[PDB]
Nucleic acid binder design. Sequence first.
RNA 1: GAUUAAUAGGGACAGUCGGGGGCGUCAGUAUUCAAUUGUCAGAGGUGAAAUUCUUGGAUUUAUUGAAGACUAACAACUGCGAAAGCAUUCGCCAAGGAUGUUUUCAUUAAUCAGGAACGUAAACUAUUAGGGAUCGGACGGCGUUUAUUUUUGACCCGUUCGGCACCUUACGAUAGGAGUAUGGU
Lengths: 49, 115, 49, 66, 103, 201, 104
Amino acid sequence: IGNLDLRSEKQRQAERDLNTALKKYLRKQRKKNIIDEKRLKAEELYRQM
Amino acid sequence: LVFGVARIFASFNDTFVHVTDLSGRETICRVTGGMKVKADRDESSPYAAMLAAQDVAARCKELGITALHIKIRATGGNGTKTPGPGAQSALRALARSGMKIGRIEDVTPTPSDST
Amino acid sequence: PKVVKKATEIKREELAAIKRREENERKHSNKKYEKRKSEREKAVLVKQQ
Amino acid sequence: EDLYFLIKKAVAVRKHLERNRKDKDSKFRLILIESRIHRLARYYKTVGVLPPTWKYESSTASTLVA
Amino acid sequence: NDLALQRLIAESHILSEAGANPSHWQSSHAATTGTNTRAFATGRIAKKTTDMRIQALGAKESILTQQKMPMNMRKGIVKHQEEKEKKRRQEARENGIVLEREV
Amino acid sequence: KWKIEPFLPGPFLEESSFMTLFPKYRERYLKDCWPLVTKALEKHGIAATLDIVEGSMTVKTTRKTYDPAAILKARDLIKLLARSVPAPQALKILEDGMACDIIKIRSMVRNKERFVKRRQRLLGQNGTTLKALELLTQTYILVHGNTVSVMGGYKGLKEVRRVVEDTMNNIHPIYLIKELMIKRELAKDPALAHEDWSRYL
Amino acid sequence: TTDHYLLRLFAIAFTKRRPNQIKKTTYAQSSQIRAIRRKMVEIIQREAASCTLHQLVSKLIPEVIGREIEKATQGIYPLQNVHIRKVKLLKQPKFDLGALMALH
RNA sequence: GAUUAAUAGGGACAGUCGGGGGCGUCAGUAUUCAAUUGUCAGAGGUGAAAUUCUUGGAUUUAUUGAAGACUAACAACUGCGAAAGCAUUCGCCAAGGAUGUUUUCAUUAAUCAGGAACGUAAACUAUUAGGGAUCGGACGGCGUUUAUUUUUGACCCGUUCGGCACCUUACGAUAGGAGUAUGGU
């Protein structure tokens, strides 16, 4: 009782200061099928790879 | 695969299954909805559209075209701009009895300003 | 009391609006390449003898 | 002169109105501009800068474009 | 002058939230919800409509409402209902849907 | 004679596809109501994608789609989802007996304040006349800005068409609801199955 | 065209919503719309008056005209997509089998 | 011999702004009518029907032509006009608004007796104190895109006038019916 909420402390500090996984990323995000411009950037990255 | 163009005029009172060539000029075979149902109440019904589509597909497979491009329309001037039950039921029966479907388009007359 | 509570809610809204205007002018003006002046330092306009 | 520009605007409005004859917004703006002309003209009469028998109905418009 | 027209207009909310419109999505959900597929749902709707009829005849207070709550339950209930109606008003101001005007 | 059977069982040569365009305030709601839509359209056999970058819903017929009217169902579904019908109702168009319709009512009143008054008259006090029309006609009516979007069976589509035109032409919807209630009472008993019912309205 | 075929070209052009913007309405002003339409009719006249009908169809197929309208109107207001929505041939005064078979 | 130049006026100029107005012109479909073909038994309405049109071929399919109307979608918690009202393009004609100016006469003004111009419906109802949006100027700018690089425009941001509307706060305010009887006519 009195220890840190680490997620809340990281969010507080954020609001104060303000090739093997990127294939299963597309495997998980081809199933939605929302196009979602971060996936467009990921498709261009996969085409470059 | 000889593509014939099927005009399906689906209104609320009667459905028109009509088959033309690619030109639009020469009617191959048409069966209206009301000539398959004794009742003018049930002239525009999915059963009427199913019977009409079966007769039209039978005639056009006797002529040997076995492929259609389907243009669906309705009463569009001051009408409803939506097809009746004849469109869905006729397309279902038409492709359920042979007839590899090609291109589907809903060519309803949409006025730019009517009244 | 209700007048003090309503007016401190209005004061919070106005101070947040002024901070947002200043932050947007900082992010889109030439003041971006400066150190943020602290508020205790901003408390004094000039000092003279 | 203010009165000179106002009567110039009046002749322009009346000439367009004579060419077109169908619209009413130009007629309403003509009524506004003739009321403005008569008010400024009355103030300049009671000062006295212009003749007190000088009048503008349409003939002064005609004789000042002519 | 007409009675059953006035009854059909007022009780339309209760009927269309109970079961009576299978093309409406809220009524097609409330037709399988469980408190309308139970044994005596039609009688419970009849009790609600009879309470609204006596309210239209002149009763100021209801029989179906609960009168004593521990002030945190009632504040949470009223605040949630007001926030729901406000969110529906905002999501109908956007999308251009017009809604029934009531204060 | 009127009932329609579900399709039991490649009927498409050219891979058909349709698109509709939506704005951003609909992009949020569509982004968090989309998996219901693509689940039911996968049960019908049609691939449905959403594009938040351009703002476009696309449907396209896959290899294993067998119902050929499913593409018309999906085209109407994405039209209503673009025109901001809620998602379970837009998915309720995918049943066999449903159909949608859009009624353009802005052309019917020359004035503006008279149009606002007549549209709010169509909507009624606390929505009671609108849900009374929805009950008596078995439809879903959405008074959508300058248009009115209705769904349901084709009979209900015709009756709400008549009621919406007569509401815009200064006949009251309470009068039309009384008319529909009389028609329901007369069609209840088939002893009066074919007479001219104009002697009662 | 240079083969004396009169035809009407109907072009449509939707306004570009600029990325990294916050305002919801991308409205061009009315004078800006008139300038866009003036540049549109200038482009389609200058790039359809010089060629024959076969080259005009060969330019219509990959949509070179809409691409050049998109490229040259972006100094007035950027346009999301320019298409030519209709081509209508009104009168063909010649029946010549020479050019009509040089097609086929 | 002639004040402040008003945080009231009227005018001038410049870039503009507007689905404000008039005249012409250009289109777009749709409807009706007619013609040419392919037709080949109903079509049309309705909750059902009926009147009607239908082997001289209706409804339908395709292509033209004419006429009259209107300007879908864009289309708004917007724009313009004093009001009714005003949405196709282009041209002409005047007018108007706001802004800016290193623009002028200096009370010209405010309000309305009299008068003058424009013209099937109803039916549920000195500041507030700022903020978030919005559009019309004018100014400023870290920057993305025009841009082969300067213009210039689009986007973002800030300042400033002006205006339709939202919410909060008020600064406050303030403006006989229904039953039951009894006796007459």
